């Protein structure tokens, strides 16, 4: 048989059969509802547009993400997402296919328990397993040590692993992610005279953020260059014309990662959190962790982010320690690749949670030692 590797994540569901090189179906994780009444009769509009279809009907729909920060807040919407993924994007019945799910560290136990219950009850999958989004990313990089920084759309976290032994006391989680960057970009774009309020145009602002924003190696020098010259301004074409030009805002949006105080958060920057995590571990493995930094998640796709992170960590770290940052081109899909690799392992076939086991011992099986 074959195993399904579903990665719910947040803002992007990617899924595909285990053993494939790349995920087969990737689409945004949104649920759209019509906010108008409809005058034409006989069309028979559906009451809920789910997945990529909602992206084509943004102008007559209100879009809601079922996942705020890793956790699921609207279970009906998530069930709709899962049903659409299983029956439309993949067109494969889950009755005879084990499933591998991924979630971030340090999440409420009720979330995992309810996910397992829904998957065993509604879809009746033969078996399922849950993994951390960081260990799979480490698998996908062909490594066995180092720290992994998984900066997704909902949550960011750092997980140090040495020789396959995780260190729970050094795992760090920060709620700043791509969604907050998009909100900040919407907020600061007002100073230039552009107003974005509707949820539909939040997607537009996300598109500008993806296409134009970049990370500055140095902040003050870039601010001075932008204030003096105008070579950094770039123009973007909106869906209805009226091209808009953005300058200094181009690199202010991604700086929030290193400067959380822009959005009011008291927590330290990404580099400082990584550095603190590095020293939170023992002293005999700090060199390898320094030399095996791993990045994953869409938010880490900004141009020039790797250089800035390396410079900051080198400034913080002792001079006599070599610092290297691994930034493969496929950061976004690294987690799914790692999950597919893990599912293809022969030794993993005994770690599945059988339906009979769940029925006998109840939903709390996942938390028990039969992880």
């Amino acid at each position: 048989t074959t195993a399904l590797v579903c990665d719910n994540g947040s803002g992007l569901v990617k899924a595909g059969f285990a053993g494939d090189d790349a995920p087969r179906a990737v689409f945004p994780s949104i649920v759209g509802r019509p906010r108008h009444q409809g005058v034409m009769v006989g069309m028979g509009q559906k009451d809920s547009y789910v997945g990529d279809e909602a992206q084509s009907k943004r102008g007559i729909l209100t879009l809601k993400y079922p996942i705020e920060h890793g956790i699921i807040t609207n279970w009906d919407d998530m069930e709709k997402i899962w049903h659409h993924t299983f029956y439309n994007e993949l067109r494969v019945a889950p009755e005879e296919h084990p499933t591998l799910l991924t979630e971030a560290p340090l999440n409420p136990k009720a979330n995992r328990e309810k996910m397992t219950q829904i998957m065993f009850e509604t879809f009746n999958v033969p078996a399922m397993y849950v993994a951390i989004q960081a260990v799979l990313s480490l698998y996908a990089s062909g490594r066995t040590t180092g720290i992994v920084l998984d900066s997704g759309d909902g949550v960011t976290h750092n997980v140090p692993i040495y020789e396959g032994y995780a260190l729970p006391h050094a795992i760090m989680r920060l709620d700043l992610a791509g969604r907050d960057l998009t909100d900040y970009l919407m907020k600061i774009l007002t100073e230039r005279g552009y107003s974005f309020v509707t949820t539909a145009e939040r997607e537009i602002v996300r598109d500008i953020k993806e296409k134009l924003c970049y990370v500055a190696l140095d902040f003050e020098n870039e601010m001075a260059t932008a204030a003096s010259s105008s070579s950094l301004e770039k123009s973007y074409e909106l869906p209805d014309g009226q091209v808009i030009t953005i300058g200094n805002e181009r690199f202010r949006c991604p700086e929030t990662l290193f400067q959380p105080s822009f959005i009011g958060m008291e927590s330290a920057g990404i580099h400082e959190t990584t550095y603190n995590s590095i020293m939170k571990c023992d002293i005999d493995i700090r060199k390898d962790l320094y030399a095996n930094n791993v990045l994953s998640g869409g938010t880490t796709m900004y141009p020039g982010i790797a250089d800035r992170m390396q410079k900051e960590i080198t400034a913080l770290a002792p001079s006599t320690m070599k610092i290297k940052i691994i930034a493969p081109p496929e950061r976004k899909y690294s987690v799914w690749i790692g999950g597919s690799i893990l599912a293809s392992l022969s030794t993993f076939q005994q770690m599945w949670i059988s339906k009979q086991e769940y029925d006998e011992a109840g939903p709390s099986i996942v938390h028990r030692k039969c992880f």
């Binding site: 190696l217 141009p303 020039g304 250089d307």
Partner: protein
Amino acid sequence: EAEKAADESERGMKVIESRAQKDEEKMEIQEIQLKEAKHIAEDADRKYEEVARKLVI
């Protein structure tokens, strides 16, 4: 003279609509090459940006 003007109108409309389909094809092909030029321009632009960042680092 009304019939003569009708004949004038008919062959005039024929010639102008032939030119119209010709110009439609022309504008379509030029818009295609416009897209291609824009793609290559942006490709070179961000390729040079990335290599310049590599150079400075």
